[PDB]
Amino acid sequence: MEMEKEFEQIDKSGSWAAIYQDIRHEASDFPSRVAKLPKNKNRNRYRDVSPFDHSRIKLHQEDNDYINASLIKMEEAQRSYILTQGPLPNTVGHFWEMVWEQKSRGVVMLNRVMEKGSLKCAQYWPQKEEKEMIFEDTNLKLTLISEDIKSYYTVRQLELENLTTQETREILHFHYTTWPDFGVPESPASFLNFLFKVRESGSLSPEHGPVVVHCSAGIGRSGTFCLADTCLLLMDKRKDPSSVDIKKVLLEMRKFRMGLIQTADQLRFSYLAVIEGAKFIMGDSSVQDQWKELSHED
């Protein structure tokens, strides 16, 4: 595995910050004019994180179609993702409107509601079966059907009902609950365990709309998730770990949303996750059971 040797050269030489800065310098810059319109200021969580115009998700709403969300379309892998920010109190209805309109089957949440003593996301799903949520502005109803709480992630089964048409859909919410407040996980085991649980659910499959992935800004942890998934899929499709250049894939995803992978440590962690996951892709089926074990899921 040449990326495993690239990893060792970079790690041995302590060069992660340098490689990361090079990625930042080569990354695309496209206009984000709609995000910056004054009428959309209260729809953005961070003033410096905006979707590009060319890849932004549009709400089917005549008044204002804007949500801070981007479509990442990885053509060779046949995988697409919607990356978005953690919803704001005033955008929770827009968030679920997007899920409905885009026909998503899964929502992947990589942050906690409170981190570092501050709110990173609105509580946008119900906490109890008998207390459903109604989003009056977008005419949707959301019910918690069941919740499976594990040590490293929670999976929830939600029912989303379009009140205008009486149609309902089941949505799976995958909530990775153990990313540390600072830095990255020391081992990728539980994250890979988590990624494969999302895969197994059918949420990433092309018969559904794109999975919705978010953290607080929708670029750091979210970027690590998509980067790992796409790199492992490409290695699967070529069955060749050495034909996959993580840096090139990351630059191709940065054509669709700015800033993906925020720190050099997230970049290092992305390499580690792909290197370890490649053991499963290349036919060592048993490693998945070791991840579950090492993840201490129970």
Taking the CA atoms of 93, 97, 99 and 100 in sequence, report the sign of the dihedral they define.
positive
Count of C-beta atoms within a 10 Å radius of residue 78: 12
- State the binding site: 181, 215-221, 262
Structure tokens at 275: 């290197």
Give the H/E segment covering residue 145: strand 140-149
Distances (CA, A) of 150 to 177, 293, 297: 9, 13, 6
Q: Specify the DSSP class assigned to residue 209.
A: B
Assess contact for 250 and 261: CB atoms under 8 A. Answer: yes
Q: Specify the DSSP class assigned to residue 78.
A: T
> Going by C-beta distance under 8 Å and a sequence separation of 6 or more, which residues neighbour residue 281?
232, 235, 236, 239, 241
Q: What is the CA radius of gyration of the chain?
A: 19
Candidates 100, 75, 72, 88; CA nearest to 213 is 72
Candidates 36, 38, 45; CA nearest to 89 is 45
Q: Which strands form 133-135's sheet, in the order they lie side by side?
A: 56-58, 66-74, 79-84, 211-214, 106-109, 168-176, 153-162, 140-149, 133-135
Which of helix, strand or coil describes residue 9? helix
Residue type, 72: I
Distances (CA, A) of 241 to 93, 124, 223, 249, 257: 42, 39, 20, 13, 26
What backbone phi and psi angles, to 5 degrees, belong to 294? -60, -30
Q: How was this structure determined?
A: X-ray
> Going by C-beta distance under 8 Å and a sequence separation of 6 or more, which residues neighbour residue 200?
none
Among residues 121, 215, 226, 231, the one annotated as catalytic is: 215
Residue range(s) defining the domain that contains residue 259? 1-298
Structure tokens at 233: 């899929």
DSSP conformation letters of 233-273: HHHHHHT-GGG--HHHHHHHHTTTSTT-S-SHHHHHHHHHH
Q: What is the C-alpha separation between 166 and 143, in angstroms, rounded? A: 14
Q: Specify the DSSP class assigned to residue 63.
A: S
Residue 120 burial (C-beta neighbours within 10 Å; 0-12, 13-18, 19+): middle
Count of C-beta atoms within a 10 Å radius of residue 212: 27
Residue type, 117: G
Q: What is the C-alpha separation between 93 and 122, in angstroms, rounded? A: 11
Q: What is the C-alpha separation between 211 and 173, in angstroms, rounded? A: 10
Q: CA 15, 20, 21: angle at the middle one, nearest 5?
A: 100
Instruction: Check if 121 is active-site.
Output: no
Q: What is the C-alpha separation between 249 and 260, in angstroms, rounded? A: 11
Structure tokens at 251: 């630059």
Candidates 26, 8, 4; CA nearest to 16 is 8
Cβ contacts of 198-201, under 8 Å, gap ≥ 24 = 198/106, 198/108, 198/174, 199/229, 201/105, 201/106, 201/172, 201/174
Q: What is the C-alpha separation between 93 and 66, in angstroms, rounded? A: 12
Residue type, 298: D
Q: CA 163, 59, 111: angle at the middle one, nearest 5?
A: 90
Beta pairing class for 140-149 and 133-135: antiparallel
Residue 97 burial (C-beta neighbours within 10 Å; 0-12, 13-18, 19+): buried
Assess contact for 221 and 34: CB atoms under 8 A. Answer: no
Q: What is the C-alpha separation between 84 and 97, in angstroms, rounded? A: 13
- State the binding site for substrate: 181, 215-221, 262
Assess contact for 56 and 186: CB atoms under 8 A. Answer: no
Number of separate domains in the chain = 1
Residue type, 195: L
